[PDB]
Enzyme design. Structure first.
Site, mmCIF file in Angstrom:
data_model
loop_
_atom_site.group_PDB
_atom_site.id
_atom_site.type_symbol
_atom_site.label_atom_id
_atom_site.label_comp_id
_atom_site.label_asym_id
_atom_site.label_seq_id
_atom_site.Cartn_x
_atom_site.Cartn_y
_atom_site.Cartn_z
ATOM 1 N N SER A 1 0.745 -1.236 0.046
ATOM 2 C CA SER A 1 -0.037 0.101 0.026
ATOM 3 C C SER A 1 0.822 1.386 -0.039
ATOM 4 O O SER A 1 2.029 1.197 0.648
ATOM 5 C CB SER A 1 -1.145 -0.015 1.086
ATOM 6 O OG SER A 1 -1.583 1.364 1.289
ATOM 7 N N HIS B 1 -12.466 -1.755 -5.059
ATOM 8 C CA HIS B 1 -11.830 -1.224 -3.794
ATOM 9 C C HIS B 1 -12.296 -1.946 -2.453
ATOM 10 O O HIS B 1 -12.428 -1.246 -1.456
ATOM 11 C CB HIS B 1 -11.814 0.175 -3.850
ATOM 12 C CG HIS B 1 -10.854 0.813 -2.971
ATOM 13 N ND1 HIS B 1 -9.860 1.876 -3.682
ATOM 14 C CD2 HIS B 1 -10.288 0.933 -1.606
ATOM 15 C CE1 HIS B 1 -9.211 2.405 -2.736
ATOM 16 N NE2 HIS B 1 -9.388 1.852 -1.419
ATOM 17 N N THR C 1 -3.909 2.959 -8.372
ATOM 18 C CA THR C 1 -5.454 2.869 -7.962
ATOM 19 C C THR C 1 -6.057 3.995 -8.586
ATOM 20 O O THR C 1 -5.686 5.392 -8.487
ATOM 21 C CB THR C 1 -5.287 2.879 -6.463
ATOM 22 O OG1 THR C 1 -4.734 1.727 -6.056
ATOM 23 C CG2 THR C 1 -7.144 2.697 -5.965
ATOM 24 N N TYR D 1 -0.976 5.653 -5.175
ATOM 25 C CA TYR D 1 -2.024 6.810 -5.381
ATOM 26 C C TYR D 1 -1.318 8.106 -6.060
ATOM 27 O O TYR D 1 -0.206 8.239 -5.605
ATOM 28 C CB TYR D 1 -2.605 7.186 -4.111
ATOM 29 C CG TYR D 1 -3.643 6.325 -3.657
ATOM 30 C CD1 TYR D 1 -4.779 6.112 -4.159
ATOM 31 C CD2 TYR D 1 -3.431 5.640 -2.122
ATOM 32 C CE1 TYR D 1 -5.838 5.142 -3.613
ATOM 33 C CE2 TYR D 1 -4.160 4.863 -1.817
ATOM 34 C CZ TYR D 1 -5.839 4.908 -2.620
ATOM 35 O OH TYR D 1 -6.563 3.807 -2.071
ATOM 36 N N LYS E 1 -5.533 -0.217 -11.336
ATOM 37 C CA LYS E 1 -6.711 -0.851 -10.262
ATOM 38 C C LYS E 1 -7.790 -0.322 -9.936
ATOM 39 O O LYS E 1 -7.702 1.015 -9.521
ATOM 40 C CB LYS E 1 -5.494 -1.154 -9.167
ATOM 41 C CG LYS E 1 -6.353 -1.619 -7.844
ATOM 42 C CD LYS E 1 -5.407 -1.537 -6.563
ATOM 43 C CE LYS E 1 -5.862 -2.539 -5.199
ATOM 44 N NZ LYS E 1 -6.780 -1.570 -4.502
HETATM 45 C C1 FMN Z 1 -8.495 -2.223 5.279
HETATM 46 C C2 FMN Z 1 -8.460 -2.132 3.893
HETATM 47 C C3 FMN Z 1 -7.399 -0.929 3.571
HETATM 48 C C4 FMN Z 1 -7.187 -0.838 2.163
HETATM 49 N N1 FMN Z 1 -6.282 -0.105 1.951
HETATM 50 C C5 FMN Z 1 -6.098 0.284 0.227
HETATM 51 C C6 FMN Z 1 -4.995 0.798 0.149
HETATM 52 O O1 FMN Z 1 -4.200 1.404 0.826
HETATM 53 N N2 FMN Z 1 -4.668 0.910 -1.534
HETATM 54 C C7 FMN Z 1 -5.444 0.410 -2.285
HETATM 55 O O2 FMN Z 1 -5.444 0.672 -3.373
HETATM 56 N N3 FMN Z 1 -6.568 -0.345 -1.763
HETATM 57 C C8 FMN Z 1 -6.837 -0.543 -0.644
HETATM 58 N N4 FMN Z 1 -8.015 -1.376 -0.314
HETATM 59 C C9 FMN Z 1 -8.358 -2.242 -1.220
HETATM 60 C C10 FMN Z 1 -7.899 -3.670 -1.437
HETATM 61 O O3 FMN Z 1 -6.672 -3.151 -2.216
HETATM 62 C C11 FMN Z 1 -8.408 -4.558 -2.126
HETATM 63 O O4 FMN Z 1 -9.002 -3.950 -3.437
HETATM 64 C C12 FMN Z 1 -9.750 -5.108 -1.403
HETATM 65 O O5 FMN Z 1 -9.091 -5.303 0.110
HETATM 66 C C13 FMN Z 1 -10.225 -6.571 -1.893
HETATM 67 O O6 FMN Z 1 -11.403 -7.080 -1.289
HETATM 68 P P1 FMN Z 1 -11.226 -8.110 -0.027
HETATM 69 O O7 FMN Z 1 -10.718 -7.368 1.164
HETATM 70 O O8 FMN Z 1 -12.783 -8.448 -0.168
HETATM 71 O O9 FMN Z 1 -10.246 -9.211 -0.305
HETATM 72 C C14 FMN Z 1 -7.978 -1.615 0.974
HETATM 73 C C15 FMN Z 1 -8.934 -2.499 1.712
HETATM 74 C C16 FMN Z 1 -9.147 -2.672 3.042
HETATM 75 C C17 FMN Z 1 -10.264 -3.582 3.482
#
Ligand code: FMN
Ligand code: FMN
Ligand code: FMN
Ligand code: FMN
Ligand code: I2W
Ligand code: I2W
Ligand code: I2W
Ligand code: I2W
Lengths: 341, 341, 341, 341
Positions: free
Chosen positions: D106, D239, D156, D130, D215
């Protein structure tokens, strides 16, 4: 209270209002199938957001019947608002003036047409009209709206009789003793004309040069008839699910009505709008703007004018976010490809 | 009690009847899938109301097999009504006479064909018939109906054997000791003929000049066979979901049957009618009238004749309101465009 | 206990069996989506009964791979039946002999091929076979089945590895200390060959002249391959939802498989059969007979041989009633027009 | 704890984490409709397994953007992992190195790009980026990823603003006082550029020769635009349902995106992957690999590096079993006929 979405306001209102008053506002007709579906139907419409479109500048402004508004989110007619808060309709119009959006005033308001114009002189205001058996009082309401700078008439066409809302019957609903319709099934049966026909719409079209919107149309054939009678818009409405139960959700019938009018008049929607994504879905399917009913009453029940302002600001902000996340910088670029059922 | 809709009457009946008697009337066959679907299916049919049609004068009257009735809502055959109220079928026919609608008398009634004609001489009355292994007793019932001014025979065709209603088996169902079939799975197996065929329908058609309705048809091919055998109507019925479980809801099979008979005979519906909108949906899909089963028994359980009158008046008023809100001034203008599944 | 339907037997079994044993028999793979759907799918198939067909004489008899049975309802292979009742597979075969139906004996039985033939000499018996890495023990099981008058081999083809049944892992499932496979994920991984291919089916086809049924086919292309390899039937099975979760219900894939084999071999079904209407639906969609798994184990848990007899008699009677109410005097007239999804 | 599936890890995490931290990780946007659907949608896709294919040798290996991985199951970017476990992202990368799979780091990590490369030097690592209003800090992150042996950039594209996650607002979410983004709605509004357009993607494509994956694409037209801009893959992502609520499940939009890119770039999926069958369904519909978000955080909450290793090993083993039971010896033979909706 920490209220951050429209449902929180409803939950707060249930906590502070007498049961009969909460039930009067919350209730739908009979088994409340349409009441549930007005909300559920929005969830079935899925959003297909575009990325990378530049949404630094989100402009929510639009126009309703040629008048500019700050957002495509307007206050629908809900009767007897002084039951929710002492300031009732005067609180509502002040909030609308603050927000830059329009208020549709109920024919069954606990505040007069003049009182509301005096509280909100710079507010965009429209009158919702019932055709009463007494055509003189009907004409008096239209003339008062014209004199007091209201900008359109929304004629309700789905209420020849009142729907059967069971909780009102259980609670034998009436106005609290200090309140009056300052301008319920038993009252309608005594006062509202069940005979009205398209001939009465011809009369109303002749009576005023104000724009007239038919409120409560659910069929494309009826929408085309409203266009033929020279009306200036159609509010796709099932009366907040309080009239005939088992009609479709308004978001589900909206595309048929938009197709049927072939762009000749603006089409609006009410029924089940609670979230900014609901607004976005309605505009993607061709509505110019939506109206909110119950959420405004929950705003009043919380804190009068400030509670109505809060509810409108929450809808505005949810709508801005939904527009921005979908790739829409303004309402003119909200297109049909954003949604699929 | 403050009972304002048919469900309230059921809830009251559960509160006052012995469990075995309530379960006998409420129960469907096996897992009760069709019992749930007879109600759920009505909710899937959505109404598309016309506005501005002039509904000051709503006329609910119609005719069933050439006889005028006050409303397209008639009492279906339900056995052993004296289990619900001491006056049983005599209470029911008196209420039908008051309302101006018809009563279908069960072959398994706790009151005789003559007793019911004596209690309701001016009431429209029909006999529901089972073809018993004893054709002499079968013929005696038909001749008694003719002599006592009954106006049609509804021959039940879906009961070669009784359905398996689990609660009756758990409760080992029987008549209370003071009651008799004045003219259950074990009883049917001893008395009802599982051999009957279309040849028995030819016999019955030859036996009486009274109109004959086939009750319990669910297939268009069977409906066309009933027309070929000279019968005068088809009651689309799954026997209140008490025979074969997993058949469709009657409102879902009604359009196939109406199509199949090509207007040669009247088509009726029973199964799951609880609300005026149910009646409206059935007529929009081509039924001439509907029959109610369980709601009448709940009316008796509440207050005998007055409770049956109340249930019929609630259905009448809900139906009038549904007609008026849909733009229908009479039953002749209730058309197929009012509904979509 | 007053057990009058198959669900009642399951509820009784949960009340009397240790949790680990009940869970072993009840469990499906992973989240148990297919386990729920094997039952739910039957409810989506609706029945379209014919009336007035003469069902005084209902004949349930049929044949499986040329052998007469009393009903198209046969006992499927369920492992380690002595965990449910001391008499285990010997109780089951005795009940099958009483009923005039067939028993499929598990390769993982708590009773030997000879023991079961000795307990049920006049019973129709088949062997369910796993192809073990040890082809000598595999061949020994086939030769024993031939010598002991078993009439077919059901080769299980959907178990290269054992499915992941969470409750068995939570309970670390094992046989009670006094019991043995007289002829679990860890055991399969040590004993069952994950390499088997259609070449192994060619070997098995060469090994025995007994009819061979492929058990666990879910695709029409695989069914056509089984026909090409000279097998004599296909048991449409998802292994009681205990192998790959998220496969369809067997009643939903049955029509594809019946179409794909073009009448060249009998098609059978197992998975979710609990009611006579389930049997009727499977035969209407072209299965020759169905197999029941769990209900037999619940019969044993209740009362050994008598409990298995009771469960088979309940299914027989529910099936007779469903046939009679649908207008079917025998299994040969159960046709595809009786069902629609 | 006895945790044997990914749901068990979530249940354990809810038991040990502070409410605000659990809610931050679990929450979706608004009413969480998409959050529920990302899981529910997988259950609607049914599997059609082939039998008898020889699955003794199951090979899970594949490649992502030309780099070999042990399984098509990779760690997605989840912010601020040190809130779940003291070792945070360093625990995660060590587990990825053990498993032979890749970690997407991340941009909002509680560990620096260099710290993670130092903890997992032999691990396959990618940077999620980002585009910050500060293009200098954006460029610094890309150059650091290049210098520290990261193998791709996942940009993203669905976050011009942060989604509205109600529980974070109720809990006024912030980092615990000892933690920092070592390289939330208020923070995004201050730091993330809502103006970015395809012109910014042209800039990023010019900035690095590393492979770039877009993404958060949900539309085929946007996927084709990403291909036109010279990007090297598309991560079909909503996301984790935390941005626009009411978009479809990623498994439902995956086939449109795979069709739209016509094999020009790899397509990946995240959102709702909890089980080996989810992985199998995504690969059958054309994804090269899937990413897991929340399950990794639950692994950390349980036992840091060992808990992440356990979650990845459970997914690996469930995926191997699902492949084997479906007849797939390797990922190259996982085809579209394995699934139907
Ligand atoms: C707690 C949390 C934090 C996240 N932080 C980011 C992030 O920093 N960058 C990002 O592009 N997506 C972020 N996401 C999206 C995840 O990359 C990913 O698309 C998503 O968790 C996938 O679904 P799942 O949790 O059902 O496996 C985050 C998701 C969660 C649950
Ligand atoms: C408490 C209540 C009172 C209403 N009063 C009126 C009325 O006076 N005039 C009218 O035309 N519609 C009236 N309606 C219908 C609303 O104008 C509007 O169609 C409906 O509230 C929209 O649905 P919503 O409440 O789901 O937002 C009323 C609705 C409610 C809930
Ligand atoms: C308690 C009970 C008794 C019934 N008795 C008879 C009967 O004697 N004759 C008959 O043909 N149908 C009988 N039926 C079926 C009804 O005529 C009718 O088809 C059914 O009640 C309609 O559905 P409803 O109860 O949902 O209104 C009975 C139904 C019930 C609930
Ligand atoms: C407890 C249990 C044990 C089973 N053991 C075997 C077995 O030894 N051999 C086999 O091929 N299938 C076995 N199966 C699958 C059954 O033969 C059959 O496919 C399944 O039980 C049918 O579904 P039902 O239980 O819903 O009737 C077993 C099923 C259960 C529930
Ligand atoms: O049609 C009627 C009465 S017709 C009738 N028939 C028997 N008695 N009366 N009017 C309705 C409109 N009118 C009004 C509209 C809004 C508020 C107020 Cl105060 C007043 C009330 C009276
Ligand atoms: O078919 C039979 C008997 S055949 C038979 N076989 C062995 N024993 N009896 N009848 C049915 C109709 N019948 C009737 C119909 C309604 C009410 C009353 Cl009292 C009477 C009763 C008797
Ligand atoms: O394939 C094997 C063993 S292969 C192997 N590899 C390492 N150790 N063993 N056999 C399976 C069939 N066999 C059997 C079938 C049913 C019950 C009973 Cl007792 C026995 C057991 C043994
Ligand atoms: O765009 C900005 C600031 S723009 C701005 N406008 C008003 N104040 N600041 N940067 C974002 C990236 N940057 C970063 C990325 C990840 C972690 C860390 Cl420490 C740092 C923080 C700062």
């Amino acid at each position: 209270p920490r209220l951050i979405c429209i449902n929180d306001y409803e939950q707060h209102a249930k906590s502070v209002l007498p049961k009969s008053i909460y039930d009067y506002y919350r209730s739908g007709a009979n088994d409340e199938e349409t009441l549930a579906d007005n909300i559920a139907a929005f969830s079935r419409w899925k959003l297909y957001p575009r990325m990378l479109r530049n949404v630094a500048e989100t402009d929510l402004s639009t126009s309703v019947l040629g008048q500019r508004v700050s957002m495509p989110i307007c206050v629908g007619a809900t009767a007897m608002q002084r039951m929710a808060h002492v300031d009732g309709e005067l609180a509502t119009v002040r909030a609308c003036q603050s927000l830059g959006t329009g208020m549709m005033l109920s024919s069954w308001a606990t505040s007069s047409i003049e009182e509301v114009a005096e509280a909100g002189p710079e507010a965009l205001r429209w009158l919702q009209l019932y055709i009463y058996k007494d055509r003189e009082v009907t004409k008096k309401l239209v003339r008062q709206a014209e004199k007091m700078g209201y900008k359109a008439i929304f004629v309700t066409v789905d209420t020849p009789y009142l729907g059967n809302r069971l909780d009102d019957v259980r609670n034998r609903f009436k106005l609290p003793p200090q309140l009056r319709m300052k301008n319920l099934a038993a009252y309608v049966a005594k006062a509202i004309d069940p005979s009205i026909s398209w001939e009465d719409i011809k009369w109303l079209r002749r009576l005023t040069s104000l724009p007239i919107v038919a409120k409560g149309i659910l069929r494309g054939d009826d929408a085309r008839e409203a266009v033929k009678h020279g009306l200036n818009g159609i509010l796709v409405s099932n009366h907040g699910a309080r009239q005939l139960d088992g009609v479709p959700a308004t978001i589900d019938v909206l595309p048929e009505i938009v197709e049927a009018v072939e762009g000749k008049v603006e089409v609006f929607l009410d029924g089940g709008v609670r979230k900014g994504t609901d607004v976005l879905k309605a505009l993607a399917l061709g509505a110019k703007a939506v109206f909110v009913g119950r959420p405004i009453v929950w705003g009043l029940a919380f804190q009068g004018e400030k509670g109505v302002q809060d509810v409108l600001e929450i809808l505005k902000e949810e709508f801005r976010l939904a527009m921005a996340l979908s790739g829409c910088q303004n309402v003119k670029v909200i297109d049909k490809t954003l949604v699929r059922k």
